[PDB]
Amino acid sequence: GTSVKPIFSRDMNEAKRRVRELYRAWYREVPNTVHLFQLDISVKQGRDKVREMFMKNAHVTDPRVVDLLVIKGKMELEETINVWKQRTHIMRFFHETEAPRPTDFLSKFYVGHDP
Amino acid sequence: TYKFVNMREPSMDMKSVTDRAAQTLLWTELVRGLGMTLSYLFREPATINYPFEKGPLSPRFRGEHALRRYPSGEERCIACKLCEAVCPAQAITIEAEPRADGSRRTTRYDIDMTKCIYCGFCQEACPVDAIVEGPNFEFSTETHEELLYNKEKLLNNGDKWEAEIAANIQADYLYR
Amino acid sequence: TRPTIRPRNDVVHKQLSAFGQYVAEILPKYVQQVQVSCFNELEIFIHPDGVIPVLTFLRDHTNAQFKSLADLTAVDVPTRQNRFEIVYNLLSLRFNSRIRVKTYTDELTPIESSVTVYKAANWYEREIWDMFGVFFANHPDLRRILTDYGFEGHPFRKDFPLSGYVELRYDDEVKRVVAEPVELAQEFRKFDLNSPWEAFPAYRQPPE
Amino acid sequence: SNLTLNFGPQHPAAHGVLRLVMELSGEMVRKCDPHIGLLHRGTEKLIEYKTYLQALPYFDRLDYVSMMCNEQAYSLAVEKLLNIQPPPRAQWIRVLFGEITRLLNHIMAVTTHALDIGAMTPFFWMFEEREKMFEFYERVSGARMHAAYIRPGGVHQDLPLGLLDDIYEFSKNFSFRIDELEEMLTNNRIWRNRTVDIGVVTAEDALNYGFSGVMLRGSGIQWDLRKTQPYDVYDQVEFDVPIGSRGDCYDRYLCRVEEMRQSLRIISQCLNKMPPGEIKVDDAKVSPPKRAEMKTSMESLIHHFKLYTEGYQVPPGATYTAIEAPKGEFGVYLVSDGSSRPYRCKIKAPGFAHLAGLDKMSKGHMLADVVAIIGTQDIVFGEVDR
Amino acid sequence: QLIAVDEKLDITTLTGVPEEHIKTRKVRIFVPARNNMQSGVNNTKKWKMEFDTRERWENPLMGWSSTADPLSNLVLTFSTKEDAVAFAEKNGWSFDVEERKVPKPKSKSYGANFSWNKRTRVSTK
Amino acid sequence: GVRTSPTGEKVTHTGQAYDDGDYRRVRFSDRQKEVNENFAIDLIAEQPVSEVGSRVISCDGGGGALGHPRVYINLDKETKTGTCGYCGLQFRQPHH
Amino acid sequence: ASKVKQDMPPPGGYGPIDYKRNLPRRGLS
Amino acid sequence: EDNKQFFGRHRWVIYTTEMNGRDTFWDVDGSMVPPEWHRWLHCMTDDP
Amino acid sequence: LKKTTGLVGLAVCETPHERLKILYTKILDVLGQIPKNAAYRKYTEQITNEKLGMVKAEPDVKKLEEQLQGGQIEEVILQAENELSLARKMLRWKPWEPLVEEPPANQWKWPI
Amino acid sequence: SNLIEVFVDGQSVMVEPGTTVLQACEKVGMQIPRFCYHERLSVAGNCRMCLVEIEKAPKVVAACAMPVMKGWNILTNSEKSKKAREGVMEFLLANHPLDCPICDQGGECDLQDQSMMFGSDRSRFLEGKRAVEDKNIGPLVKTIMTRCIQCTRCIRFASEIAGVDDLGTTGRGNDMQVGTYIEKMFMSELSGNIIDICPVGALTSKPYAFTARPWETRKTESIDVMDAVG
Amino acid sequence: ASATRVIQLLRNWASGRDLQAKLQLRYQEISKRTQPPPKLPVGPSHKLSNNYYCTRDGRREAMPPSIVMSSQKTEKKAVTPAPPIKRWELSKDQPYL
Ligand code: SF4
Ligand code: SF4
Ligand code: SF4
Ligand code: SF4
Ligand code: FES
Ligand SMILES: [Mg+2]
Ligand SMILES: [Zn+2]
């Protein structure tokens, strides 16, 4: 039973449909974002980044969590379309000033104590 | 108990109506405002001739911090760390150890004056009147680093301002 | 118990207790508990489903007339299965009284928006969503209100760190403000202040 | 398609930190969308890491035009949670300085509102009075605005000898400055054209939108927390409540001017009725002992040490305490878990709801009308963003 | 009508916590030991969750203590061990739980100070 | 009681001086190192020991309430003087 | 052994303070 | 001093033309006042 | 007869007695569809009948306002409208029924 | 079984014979204030801070030493108990030195905390204070005996746990002093523990002196590797 | 004020008021910057007897809130949270501005 109240979707299929709607909206919006914000990236870079952000949460299996993630993505898209975000906010997705952090054991061992 | 601010009525007699018409056509209230500004023009201004003249301050005024001494030259601070504990901005950093003669004294006493809110809680908390907010307020700098005071800076401030600090404390301490 | 001690008001205490019993009798479907504090403040603990029917009642009933919504906020208590306590503070000018309505929710359960009851709730609910992550159903325009654009997390949660996760600076290579993982020249110094001796025997809990 | 405009933050009428996204048709305002948080500093979370005394100075910086009123609201909340009573002289000093603070705030509100509208001169005349008032602050506490003077348990220090006479000297002259301001504005036809029937709000809408203070009383609602829910010694002073009739900018400006006059009346009563006695509660587990006692007696030293390191424990419980601050109802929802640090502190600021009502109030108006309505709401963003 | 999910609770994707500070952290769930300097026991009633200690270093200016992990001051309080475990699990943090230590009851006899034939007899008071 | 290091850097009363190979000394180039010249330990060393005719003396640091908390100092030991834990002033009973 | 000395109002209270509006008519017909 | 001027103009300083090492004929600032005259000049006391 | 209520947006009501009678009658009619043992029905019927009798007993508007303790009979009419709307909503909600669920064991326990 | 029923503020408790009033109170989560009592040391009963009223009993009892009787109702928060605690705290603080800013115990001091929780907030002692000379007992345990409250905890620990009979009391009355009576070092493999059991700053750690305050320290629970005891 | 008499008269006429009576700038009338020392009395708890703290302890008289109608566990006239507020009275001092 588990007696849980839904947010928007009753099972995973409607949640996936909402995910697809949000993905379509972002994919359509990307070229306008590149033009309006005067970005130096390509439209392919922006769409690849959009895909990456969506793929980050592919493991989620709870329809309520999926609905909340879609709500947050819609909020981000509304911020972007209305130019409430500036160029710094958009570019924050790319981390262009952070040095590449090593992942293998040996480099982390050399650089410090963090596991 | 209350009053109305905009609940009056104008009299409709020909005298009041004609007076209103004369005000409308001859701009009497605008001339009244002009007269008020003209009156202010001939008043003496309130400007003081800074920096040759200064604004008045109280003995309780909170200014740049200082560390004080006993009349023998011994430091008043005994590293109890009550000022560090009470500080609402965590602007005070204290390290201490027994001195060569066994006295309880600080080795580090730092105040970050860019963290400080100048509330004076440190001098209220101090049991020996060691840390104070002095009267000086003109200590602007050209770099951020100069506002990170160490213990030597605070002792120099105390030595430089003690003559004024002691008089202000003598003036105010019966209220504390 | 003279000058130092705050005086008591039995008349207001009795009046508030009677009105709390009144409200509990009228709405048994939703009211779970009623309390009157010793400084004369009335609290009504309700099931979440009753957020709209209770508030509406307290706004529209001839004997309540709580027309003003003073404040609406949330409290985070991580030890509870339902993390978030939702608090409504209401003021009745007709009867010169105040009341508090309390309900609960967790991270994934929406709470009905009360903009149809009090329009003032709009921004308050936004703030709650911004600071605690509580979603309000049927809100006209729900989005962040206090945090920076694109900010991740809900800062007022107890498990959110005080300095957050990212800080900002101007970078000249890219000619813009950038966000990077936070690094502090001086770490905030955690203080352990609690005395190991009990302060108030009147609030002692059973030793389990 | 309407034109979209950023009104602020770097704008003269935007108060520094307000970004207002405005949708316009010509200069007609189709929609107002205030974006705030440009001064959100996380005060409510920071307070959770402070003792109650350590948390007190954060309230000076919420509504930085009305410092001691914020201090008083927080002190009343903490005193209610502690089940203690401030001494009478402390309460009289609190009311006196609260009315001085209301004078400061109403000067700032009226003159900056006039400056947005275009009348720049009264700002200069009234800010010298603000300067003199600042000296009263500094003489009592050592700080011109962020006094931290009013604390749970009473006040930090007693008044210095000679302060009451100087306050009396200032108070016996402030009425003429009010008269000059009213001579410049009240009957001026340009001022009335800029203020009459602008931002009209109904009583029902004002109540439903969470308004408080003048934003209520300008619409005819007879409500004042000092009268209906008195605190300290407000039930011992005589004053009148100004009530508007149109719910517009002009009536609210008239109400604020009359509130200044009534504040002068209250200040006179406070000056003539100040009693003798101690200025903080005679309970060393709450209020610190005098410095001479701390340096002589063992219990006083122990209590000084503990109150300045750990702070007093507050019994567990939650209170919503509100006062009639100069900008409306200012409230604190304070939750104590029994320790010496507050568990939760939600701050209710009147400007929050007032600014949330700005889009409703601006319907059918122009750009300059929106500037006037922003001025008439009396918004400070330290309390809006917290 | 309700939707009847059947999966364990997981809110990691919603908390805004960086990946590194989820999978590399170890939280300790424990009842804090009594400070040996005092006899009061009021600080040994509730359960605490704390994080693993990371690197601190010396600031080149001022010699202050500098850190780079945002969770160095995060301590949560819980009524029971189960509540803390549930909170840690739904946030994806690996945890180590230490059982509560209670002092064992003891037999105190004042008269034993003056025993006729036992070693419990005291030589001074 | 100021004193100079082998590098020419003045040593503070905390005994802190940068080593010969320490890069941080570069912060003092074209500028100076703030050092307080009134060493408290030497200054309190110059105060004379007060002879008093009681076994217990009281010290508050002078100035009444402007000093430090009043403490009582035992003077039974003839091998050493009684030192104030706040002020550093020394006391003894007359001997010899 | 001196008397208690505190900031207090002078005996008989302070002089009356004006607060009401004062805008004289000050004009011809 | 001139007590016939209003409060704030009744006390003032004429700065020296040469302090510790620098020429202060044109370049003066409030930090040049020593503490005793700082107390007198800001009216924290009535006694020079 | 009265020039203004003094409240912005609240019009002066001509014939307030008849309006009040209509509104109280409508409220009682709606309450008649609520179960007899529901506390809302009996309480609201008691207060509504008190106000209706008071309205029928005093033909002077000022004295009726003084008796009703309701603040300016136009606001009495507004409050009657609010009560009628609430009565319809309550008939829909049926809050006279037993509590839907008991909170968790330590949902309201404070502290911790 | 063989348990007897007592009451703590009217709440029923079953305890085994020989249980003291203090132990019965802590069975219901009530901690009686104490200075001289330590559950790993022999009972002393000298500090008198644990005095508590028994219902229908005219005289208060020392909870640390008094066996609890069947049917007794212990009143932990009655007027008699609170007044006894206030009087004892006043007596303890009458001669105590005003050393808190320079005392290492400050912030983790049972005297300070129990003064704040069970004592009054002011003083009415108008005399001069006693001052005693210091005893040198080694390079580990710093001694400042003006702060000593004569608990006898160090003496009982040295005798019973460490098996060293070198500590004691000399003199009597107000002049009673805790020490060795000769210049002697208390050098035991367990000597440092007398720092922790001492409620006040009379015995402190010499290597640790003046370096830190208790509230700024972070606590890491760990294991010792200096031997194989763990 | 050092203003000449003709300028004073012109100021008074332009303002329509007696400006010299209430001058914004402050002269000799204000209190001296040097004051005699205060004495500052003490509070009601500064007593040598009949002053036990347990009889004046406000914090310890606080207790948990009264529980009315837990859910776990006739005539019945209706009630309001408080008596209706009494209507405000118009000011005698100045009813209208
Ligand atoms: S004035 Fe306040 S903020 Fe500044 S160091 Fe002192 S206590 Fe800290
Ligand atoms: S300055 Fe004062 S409060 Fe701070 S450590 Fe030194 S003695 Fe203690
Ligand atoms: S032992 Fe405790 S009460 Fe005594 S001086 Fe030290 S800290 Fe203060
Ligand atoms: S030194 Fe400590 S343990 Fe020993 S008698 Fe004194 S107070 Fe008790
Ligand atoms: S604890 Fe019982 S007498 Fe000391
Ligand atoms: Mg010890
Ligand atoms: Zn001394």
Side-chain angles (χ1 to χ4, degrees), chain B residues 67 76-84 92 94 106 109 122 125-131, chain J residues 101:
Chain B
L67 280 174
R76 283 175 169 268
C77 181
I78 53 71
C80 74
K81 295 165 150 285
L82 301 204
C83 57
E84 192 181 33
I92 307 172
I94 299 170
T106 50
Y109 195 100
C122 44
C126 189
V128 297
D129 307 19
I131 183 72

Side-chain angles (χ1 to χ4, degrees), chain J residues 143-145 147-155 167 169 178 194 197-203:
Chain J
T143 267
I144 300 173
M145 299 313 276
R147 300 167 193 165
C148 176
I149 59 171
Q150 295 78 42
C151 58
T152 75
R153 268 192 185 180
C154 50
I155 298 166
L167 294 186
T169 41
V178 176
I194 66 176
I197 62 174
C198 182
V200 293
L203 304 173

Side-chain angles (χ1 to χ4, degrees), chain H residues 2 4 6-8 10-14 16 18 21-23 29-32 35-36 38-39 41-46:
Chain H
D2 190 351
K4 267 70 73 203
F6 68 86
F7 201 54
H10 69 305
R11 300 180 174 175
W12 66 94
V13 58
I14 304 301
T16 179
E18 217 271 10
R22 74 168 53 152
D23 156 53
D29 54 298
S31 68
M32 284 163 74
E36 54 272 28
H38 182 283
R39 214 174 69 103
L41 188 65
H42 294 79
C43 302
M44 300 174 196
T45 177
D46 266 341

Side-chain angles (χ1 to χ4, degrees), chain F:
Chain F
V2 82
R3 164 181 84 266
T4 79
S5 54
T7 320
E9 181 156 322
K10 315 169 109 143
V11 178
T12 74
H13 81 276
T14 65
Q16 172 284 327
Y18 283 135
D19 292 15
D20 178 270
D22 201 319
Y23 82 92
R24 266 160 315 152
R25 271 184 299 130
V26 79
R27 79 181 57 191
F28 301 135
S29 299
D30 264 9
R31 293 177 299 185
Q32 57 90 63
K33 180 187 176 191
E34 192 98 350
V35 168
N36 185 270
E37 319 278 89
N38 296 304
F39 279 28
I41 183 169
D42 301 334
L43 293 157
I44 197 61
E46 319 178 328
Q47 291 288 127
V49 180
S50 305
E51 311 282 332
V52 302
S54 57
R55 297 173 57 190
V56 172
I57 191 53
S58 172
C59 187
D60 71 334
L66 294 174
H68 65 69
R70 184 210 297 141
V71 292
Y72 298 79
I73 308 172
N74 180 266
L75 306 176
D76 280 345
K77 246 166 199 152
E78 306 301 73
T79 324
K80 54 142 217 183
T81 60
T83 307
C84 180
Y86 285 98
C87 216
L89 291 175
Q90 307 185 56
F91 310 82
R92 69 160 89 100
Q93 293 195 269
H95 57 67
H96 285 172

Side-chain angles (χ1 to χ4, degrees), chain J residues 76-123:
Chain J
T76 68
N77 209 45
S78 78
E79 225 63 35
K80 208 171 282 196
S81 302
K82 291 198 276 200
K83 293 238 255 162
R85 282 152 194 168
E86 280 180 66
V88 172
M89 184 55 65
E90 181 172 24
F91 287 135
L92 279 170
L93 292 191
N95 285 296
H96 199 70
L98 274 74
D99 274 6
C100 293
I102 71 179
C103 175
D104 276 324
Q105 204 66 28
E108 53 186 354
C109 180
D110 269 338
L111 183 51
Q112 277 186 334
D113 281 355
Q114 291 178 88
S115 172
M116 296 288 318
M117 288 332 194
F118 312 103
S120 84
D121 58 345
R122 57 205 65 233
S123 176

Side-chain angles (χ1 to χ4, degrees), chain C residues 76 78-81 83 106-108 152-154 157-165 182-190 194-199 205, chain E residues 9 11 14-18 21 38-43 46 56-57 59 64-68 70-79 83 87 90-91:
Chain C
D76 179 22
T79 199
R80 288 165 187 180
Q81 141 183 3
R83 217 186 148 161
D106 70 350
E107 289 99 325
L108 302 178
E152 307 227 292
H154 305 288
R157 291 186 180 185
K158 289 280 168 179
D159 52 341
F160 197 87
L162 169 63
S163 309
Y165 295 101
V182 61
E183 227 172 36
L184 290 155
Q186 189 171 32
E187 170 191 24
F188 180 88
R189 286 164 276 165
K190 177 156 68 68
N194 290 285
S195 174
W197 287 92
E198 161 193 276
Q205 306 168 36
Chain E
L9 180 59
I11 58 163
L14 301 169
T15 59
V17 177
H21 298 300
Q38 291 187 267
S39 302
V41 301
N42 212 57
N43 283 329
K46 306 289 154 205
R56 308 175 154 98
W57 64 95
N59 186 57
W64 290 334
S65 185
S66 305
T67 197
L71 299 172
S72 62
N73 298 308
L74 209 293
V75 181
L76 300 170
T77 310
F78 297 91
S79 325
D83 297 323
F87 194 86
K90 91 180 147 177
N91 278 282

